[PDB]
Design a protein around this ligand. Structure first.
Ligand SMILES: Nc1ncnc2c1ncn2[C@@H]1O[C@H](COP(=O)(O)OP(=O)(O)OP(=O)(O)O)[C@@H](O)[C@H]1O
Ligand SMILES: Nc1ncnc2c1ncn2[C@@H]1O[C@H](COP(=O)(O)OP(=O)(O)OP(=O)(O)O)[C@@H](O)[C@H]1O
Length: 342
């Protein structure tokens, strides 16, 4: 059966606790307030906004004592053609030493701030556009739509529009073709990322799937976490979320039907790629030219495909079972101890 109440309880059990939520909310608010009132950066920092699976409501709670990774984007007005990423990041060392001495480090393209209950991951970005387009983008990044600390799940009325207040999405000509530039992973060069586009696409897909998309992402992340020793190291994180969003059809009815449908569509759609021992090329919702599966290997994708085949057999039988305890036993075989029984 579908067992929708049990699925709701499982989702509530795999969400980050309200404690951790308030923790990263307070951390982000404090960092933003300190950045806004820092004199040497008052002419540089355009905005500071939350991103990642936390804001997109696609994050699962950490294990053990592990801190929740809080991803923060710092939008500046620097010229990326005349400054390397290391210059932009060096601009922020005084702020860190003043407000987080002994707590901050450089993790390649990000700043890692180890706080008491959370870890703040700060990426330093810039706006490639100039003139009126740059001013309009700065106005958008300083709007309440971007500066919100609540996740997508906490406000279904959220849209990507500078006039939104806690109204539809803004037309695509105002944000789609305008990504930020961030530091590259290895090289000291600027790459392109569009987190706002990703968040807006996630919200749209969740609305098209009747609020089941982010929950299905959480469920598949929890499944991958519980069966980690049988599954490949990757995909996990955003590439996994993208695979799930690609596999899921619109108009999702329930958690169980949506899960079975997404697993079936994943299996049938990539069967040719699997038999060719290859990997899909999937366009990023933020930067169209980017392959989300660029760093994923073919062997890992095929191992994940086999794992999805097994999980899909189990989920099909869990959905087909007409006895509640039987369906629940199969759903727990897929999801583990934190799935409740009727
Ligand atoms: N911490 C982050 N914050 C915002 N965007 C990110 C972050 N990490 C990755 N991205 C986006 O996702 C993509 C994944 O890039 P990854 O770090 O896996 O390899 P890369 O060498 O940076 O990619 P490329 O060379 O293709 O730009 C990046 O192009 C970037 O646009
Ligand atoms: N390969 C990629 N393609 C497109 N966007 C990416 C990619 N990798 C990361 N990003 C973007 O950069 C953000 C930060 O990436 P991070 O390095 O934290 O990976 P992650 O921990 O898997 O992300 P998340 O916290 O969202 O699961 C992600 O939320 C995502 O929006």
């Amino acid at each position: 059966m579908e067992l929708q109440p049990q699925f709701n309880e499982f989702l509530a059990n795999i969400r980050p606790t309200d404690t951790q939520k308030e923790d990263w909310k307070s951390g982000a608010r404090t960092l933003r307030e300190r950045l806004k009132n820092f004199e040497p950066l008052k002419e540089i920092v355009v905005s500071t906004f939350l991103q990642g699976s936390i804001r997109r409501s696609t994050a699962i709670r950490p294990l053990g004592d592990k801190r929740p990774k809080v991803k923060i984007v710092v939008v500046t007005n620097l010229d990326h053609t005349r400054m390397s990423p290391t210059d932009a990041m060096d601009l922020f060392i005084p702020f860190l030493e003043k407000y987080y001495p002994g707590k901050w480090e450089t993790q390649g393209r990000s700043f890692g701030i180890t706080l008491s209950y959370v870890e703040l991951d700060l990426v330093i970005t810039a706006i490639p556009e100039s003139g009126a387009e740059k001013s309009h983008l700065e106005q958008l990044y300083k709007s309440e739509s971007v500066l919100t600390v609540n996740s997508l799940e906490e406000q279904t009325d959220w849209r990507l529009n500078k006039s939104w207040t806690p109204v539809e999405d803004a037309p695509a000509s105002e944000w789609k073709a305008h990504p930020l530039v961030l530091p590259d992973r290895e090289k000291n060069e600027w790459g392109r990322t569009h987190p706002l586009a990703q968040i807006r696409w996630t919200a749209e897909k969740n609305r098209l799937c009747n609020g089941h998309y982010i929950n299905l992402v959480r469920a598949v992340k929890w499944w991958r976490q519980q069966n980690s020793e049988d599954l490949p190291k990757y995909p996990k994180g955003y590439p996994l979320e993208h695979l799930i969003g690609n596999a899921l059809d619109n108009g999702t009815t329930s958690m169980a039907q949506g899960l079975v449908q997404l697993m079936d569509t994943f299996l049938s759609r990539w069967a040719a790629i699997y038999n060719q021992k290859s990997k899909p090329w999937l366009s990023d919702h933020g930067v169209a030219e980017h392959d989300v599966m660029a760093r994923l290997t073919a062997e890992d994708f095929c191992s994940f495909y086999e794992g999805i085949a097994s999980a899909a057999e189990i989920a099909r039988n869990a959905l087909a079972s007409e006895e509640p305890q039987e369906s629940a036993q199969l759903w727990r075989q897929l999801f583990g101890s934190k799935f409740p029984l009727p």
